[PDB]
Amino acid sequence: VLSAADKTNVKGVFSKISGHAEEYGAETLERMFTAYPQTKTYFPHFDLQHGSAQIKAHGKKVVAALVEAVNHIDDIAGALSKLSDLHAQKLRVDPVNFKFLGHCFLVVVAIHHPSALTAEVHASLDKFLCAVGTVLTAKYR
Amino acid sequence: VLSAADKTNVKGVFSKISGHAEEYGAETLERMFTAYPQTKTYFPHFDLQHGSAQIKAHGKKVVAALVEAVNHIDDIAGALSKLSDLHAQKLRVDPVNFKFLGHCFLVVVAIHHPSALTAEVHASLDKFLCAVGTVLTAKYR
Amino acid sequence: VHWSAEEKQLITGLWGKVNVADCGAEALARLLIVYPWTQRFFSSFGNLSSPTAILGNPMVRAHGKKVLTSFGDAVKNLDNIKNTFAQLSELHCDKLHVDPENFRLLGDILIIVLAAHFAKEFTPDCQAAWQKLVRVVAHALARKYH
Amino acid sequence: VHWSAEEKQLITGLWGKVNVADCGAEALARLLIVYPWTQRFFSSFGNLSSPTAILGNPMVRAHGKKVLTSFGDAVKNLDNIKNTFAQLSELHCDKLHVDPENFRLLGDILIIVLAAHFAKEFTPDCQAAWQKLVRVVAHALARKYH
Ligand code: HEM
Ligand code: HEM
Ligand code: HEM
Ligand code: HEM
């Protein structure tokens, strides 16, 4: 349910990552395809080799979507309604996959901005990822 | 996300069950304590014997809460905000338990009103149970 | 798992009355309507455009018959469950990449369906035994996930 | 599960640098702040009223030290994982009634914490090996759930 402090905590860590979208979204796709190989099944068409340029590019587009829901955090569904149709309806992604993606993202922010990631920002960032997950899977429920 | 047809489907089956709250909410608690005994852990104080009168009474109060969210289906969070504090904050129920409860409820409506329970009402009723689950666990996210 | 002799009685009594064709067809069709992302794995089944089209697609019916028949092999060999599903584990795990949590959504749908077909004969103790069976079957299929 | 010799190298290299006390305390404390219903099982720990109170409660620190020490016994015996956690399975399953999905939330928190302590040394291949370890540990603890 994002409280006022959650919203702020999220904004807070996104300022430190708003500057490196492409290196951060690529790294998160790479750990996702490496720790959870079953997610590679959704990108049959991409080159999935470390540093492929399709990973960098998609990486960059995955975190701008994030930044954009940070920005409209008050109505994440409304700001992301075209992505919800793509993933639920067109792509049909299984919901479990969003938790794999969300976790590889926390893992990038702890490796790179540890101190930003306290236990309470940790909790705000998780409810956020989870809100995005739910909106992107919403034409399922 | 409850669509217009979901809302109706839910109203539709709740009319057939709005008349037997107590026999239906008791039966669902009884199958829950029987198929998932780990849920008995939350009612240390109740007599949990088939037909105990505390089960009947609580059963009756569990389905009136349901009926009441059916009735304010447009804002289930708002109509159920005191129940969300009781379960999340006071009682601390683990979210998995709500899926045990929701499932033993589907199981009572199929045993008793099979034909009402088509595959599409089945899908509406599930998104509903899930919306209630999420609201009752909401002071967790 | 240990099976009591009465659990075995509640699983076998019930199983003999099951219409495998109709129960399997109904359960697969509800898996695909209630949890729509599962439709991704049955892209080869053709039209799954609507619940009404899903309900009468002949490959969904046929395939449903076949998944419930597998439940039967479990019912028959309650003690060799591992060997029974060992080849199935590799197909679902290794080949299809289905996450084990959909294995659970499907057995839960089976319980709802057998409940709608058996009404009051599906007692809470009967419910319980069948819940354990789908749980052990879901577990034998997730096993090549090592 | 099969462990490659390089997985074993990535688990052992890393483990030797771990501060068990601090990593265990941090991981238990984050489990309780991030997933608040888990606080129900540690009602005996006293004050878990705030993240700040949770962070400095001495029983959370002590207990954290002890859960990470169990991870170590796994690290040491990667092939006898079953026997190692067999008594723990009964305590968590039989006595505490913890659902196995919180076993997964806790290993995921461990990975986040070791990532924050190791930074770039925690490579995606290192991530992967550790993900498998927490998954096998989560699985050995859910086993008396039969
Ligand atoms: C936080 C969760 C996610 C966000 C914000 C997100 C973001 C995006 C964006 C922005 C696009 C459109 C890209 C474009 O227009 O070029 C996209 C597409 C896509 N997403 Fe997601 N995604 C997420 C999770 C997932 C997950 C978990 C999967 C599957 C494992 C997935 C699979 C796909 C695929 C296969 C595409 C199409 C890519 C292409 O066609 O090149 N997404 N996603
Ligand atoms: C659809 C989900 C649920 C609904 C609508 C619901 C409904 C209710 C209601 C209406 C009350 C307050 C009763 C009163 O004021 O006397 C209550 C309390 C309670 N609930 Fe829930 N409940 C649900 C799920 C759960 C689950 C899954 C659990 C745990 C397994 C749970 C555990 C409790 C307990 C232990 C109490 C206190 C009962 C007492 O103190 O006598 N509830 N619930
Ligand atoms: C635990 C419950 C399950 C059982 C007993 C089961 C059983 C079976 C059986 C017997 C086959 C047929 C293999 C053959 O005839 O060669 C099969 C195939 C298959 N299953 Fe399952 N299954 C289960 C769960 C799932 C789930 C949840 C999904 C999808 C989410 C799934 C997707 C598939 C697909 C795509 C195929 C192959 C279809 C084809 O090749 O025509 N299975 N399963
Ligand atoms: C897979 C990860 C886990 C491991 C390795 C683990 C390990 C341990 C160990 C070594 C003990 C101490 C037993 C003793 O010293 O006698 C313990 C106790 C306990 N665990 Fe876990 N645990 C795990 C997950 C969980 C989870 C997720 C929860 C709660 C959600 C939990 C709740 C408890 C409680 C309440 C106790 C007893 C505390 C006490 O008696 O003081 N455990 N666990």
The DSSP code sequence of D57-125 is -HHHHHHHHHHHHHHHHHHHTTT-HHHHHHHHHHIIIIII---HHHHHHHHHHHHHHHHHHHGGGS-HH
A119, B36, B44, B88, C127 from B33: Cα distances, Å: 35, 5, 12, 20, 11
Neighbours of A61 (CB within 10 A): 12
For atom 25 of ligand 1, the residue with the nearest CA is: A98
Is the C-beta atom of C38 inside 6 A of ligand 3?
yes
Sequence letter at residue C76:
K
Q: Which two tokens stand for residue D48?
A: 């878990």
Asked if C24 and C66 touch (Cβ cutoff 8 Å), the reply is: yes
Going by the DSSP 8-state scheme, the letter that residue A117 receives in this structure is -
Asked if B136 and B63 touch (Cβ cutoff 8 Å), the reply is: no
Euclidean distance between CA atoms B35 and B20, whole angstroms? 22
Q: Which two tokens stand for residue C2?
A: 């240990």
| Beta carbons within 8 Å of D85's beta carbon, 6+ residues apart | D70, D74, D137, D140, D141, D143
- Please report, in range form, the residues annotated as the binding site of D for heme b: 63, 92
Going by the DSSP 8-state scheme, the letter that residue C9 receives in this structure is H
Euclidean distance between CA atoms C133 and C141, whole angstroms? 12
Euclidean distance between CA atoms B134 and B131, whole angstroms? 5
Please indicate whether, in this complex, the C-beta atoms of D127 and A35 are within 8 angstroms of each other: yes
For atom 17 of ligand 1, the residue with the nearest CA is: A62
For atom 30 of ligand 4, the residue with the nearest CA is: D38
Euclidean distance between CA atoms A18 and C28, whole angstroms? 44
Euclidean distance between CA atoms C69 and B51, whole angstroms? 37
Asked if B107 and C111 touch (Cβ cutoff 8 Å), the reply is: yes
Euclidean distance between CA atoms A105 and B79, whole angstroms? 35
Chain B residues at the D interface, defined by Cβ less than 8 Å, are: 38, 41, 88, 91-96, 137, 140
Euclidean distance between CA atoms A80 and A134, whole angstroms? 11
Is the C-beta atom of B61 inside 6 A of ligand 2?
yes
What's the resolution in A?
2.0
Segments making up each domain of chain A, as ranges: 1-141
Sequence letter at residue C19:
N
The contacts found for D68-73 with CB under 8 angstroms, 24 or more apart, are: D68/D18, D68/D20, D68/D21, D68/D23, D68/D24, D68/D27, D68/D110, D69/D20, D69/D24, D70/D137, D71/D110, D71/D133, D71/D137, D72/D15, D72/D20
Q: Which two tokens stand for residue A92?
A: 């049909």
**Site of tokens 């004050």:** D47
Of B70, B101, B81, nearest to B2 by C-alpha is: B70
Rounded to a whole number of angstroms, the distance between the first and last alpha carbons of chain D is 20
SS3 call for B131: helix
Sequence letter at residue C115:
A
Euclidean distance between CA atoms C30 and C24, whole angstroms? 10
Dihedral over Cα of D34, D35, D41, D44: its sign: positive
Q: Which domains does chain D have, with CATH numbers?
A: 1-146 (1.10.490.10)
Euclidean distance between CA atoms C46 and C39, whole angstroms? 10
Within 13 Å, how many C-alpha atoms sit on residue B110's CB side?
A: 27
Instruction: Work out the angle at residue D54's Cα, subtended by the Cα atoms of residues D51 and D57, and round it to the nearest 5 degrees.
Output: 155
- Beta-strand runs (E) in C16-143: none
Euclidean distance between CA atoms A129 and A133, whole angstroms? 6
Counts of helices then strands in chain B (DSSP H, E): 7, 0
Q: Which residues in chain B are closer than 8 Å to A77, comparing Cβ atoms?
A: 1
Of ligand 1's listed atoms, the one at least distance from the Cα of A98 is 27
A30, A62, A134, D131 from A83: Cα distances, Å: 21, 10, 12, 29
Q: What is the CATH number of domain A1-141?
A: 1.10.490.10
Of A28, A25, A33, A133, nearest to A88 by C-alpha is: A133
Asked if A96 and A42 touch (Cβ cutoff 8 Å), the reply is: no
Is the C-beta atom of B87 inside 6 A of ligand 2?
yes
Angle between helix axes C124-142 and C100-118 (nearest 10 degrees) is 150
| Dist. CA B123 → ligand 1 center (Å) | 26
Dihedral over Cα of B86, B88, B94, B95: its sign: positive
Euclidean distance between CA atoms C36 and C15, whole angstroms? 28
Euclidean distance between CA atoms A80 and A6, whole angstroms? 19
User: What is chain D's percent helix, strand, coil content, to nearest 5?
Assistant: 80, 0, 20
User: What is chain C's percent helix, strand, coil content, to nearest 5?
Assistant: 80, 0, 20
| Dist. CA D72 → ligand 4 center (Å) | 14
| Beta carbons within 8 Å of C104's beta carbon, 6+ residues apart | C134, C135, C138
Please indicate whether, in this complex, the C-beta atoms of B110 and C112 are within 8 angstroms of each other: yes
| Residue C66 distance to chain B (closest CA, Å) | 20
D136 touches chain C (CB under 8 A): yes
Please indicate whether, in this complex, the C-beta atoms of B107 and C115 are within 8 angstroms of each other: yes
